[PDB]
């Protein structure tokens, strides 16, 4: 998989919006938006976070990550990881964590990043622990049929 990553732009709303394929996928990447998801929410995600990037591999978007917490000299946390339907389990998002603990060392002098995955999202868990994020808490949550699930409070020191 040949890689790259810029700043998310305008022109790439629409792609990253298609991403999610069903309620659950949404739910797990951004809790707050309502299914369908759609160019105008992400937007607001966009807006009110920092870091919004993407990954790129020929010619195509493929990944979506930001930050939505933010802490100079201390930590971000990771949201709104978006992987390509026909680009998962290839490295995407694996890729696109490494550029975002990058941008949180080098930018916001962060010494930790934070990941929060909920319960039922196996692959995610998986994922952060072979890159080597440590579970520290667990938080009860509700899904948006009012449902408890477990969120997973994760962190690795960066560097
Ligand atoms: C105000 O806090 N309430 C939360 C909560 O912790 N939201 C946080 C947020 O934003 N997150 C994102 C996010 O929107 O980015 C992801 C997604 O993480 C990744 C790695 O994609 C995982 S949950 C976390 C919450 C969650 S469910 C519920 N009923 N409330």
């Known amino acids: 998989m040949q890689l790259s990553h810029r700043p998310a732009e305008t022109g790439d709303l629409e792609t990253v919006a298609g991403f999610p394929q069903d309620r659950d996928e949404l739910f797990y990447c951004y809790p707050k ?9 992400l937007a607001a995600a966009i807006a009110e976070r920092r ?33 390509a339907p026909a680009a998962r389990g290839l490295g995407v998002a694996r890729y696109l964590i490494g550029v975002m603990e990058n941008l949180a060392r080098e930018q916001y002098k962060a010494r930790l990043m934070k990941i929060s995955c909920f319960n039922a999202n196996a692959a995610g868990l998986l994922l952060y622990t072979q890159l080597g994020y440590q ?16 969120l997973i409070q994760m962190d690795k020191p960066l560097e």
């Open 51 to 83: 870091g919004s990037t993407v990954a790129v591999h020929d010619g195509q978007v493929l990944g979506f990550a930001n930050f939505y917490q933010w802490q100079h000299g201390d930590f971000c946390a990771l949201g709104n990881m978006m992987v």
């Open 33 to 41: 938006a309502i299914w369908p998801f759609s160019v105008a929410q």
């Open 135 to 150: 579970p520290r808490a667990i938080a009860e949550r509700h899904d948006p049929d009012g449902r408890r699930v477990a």
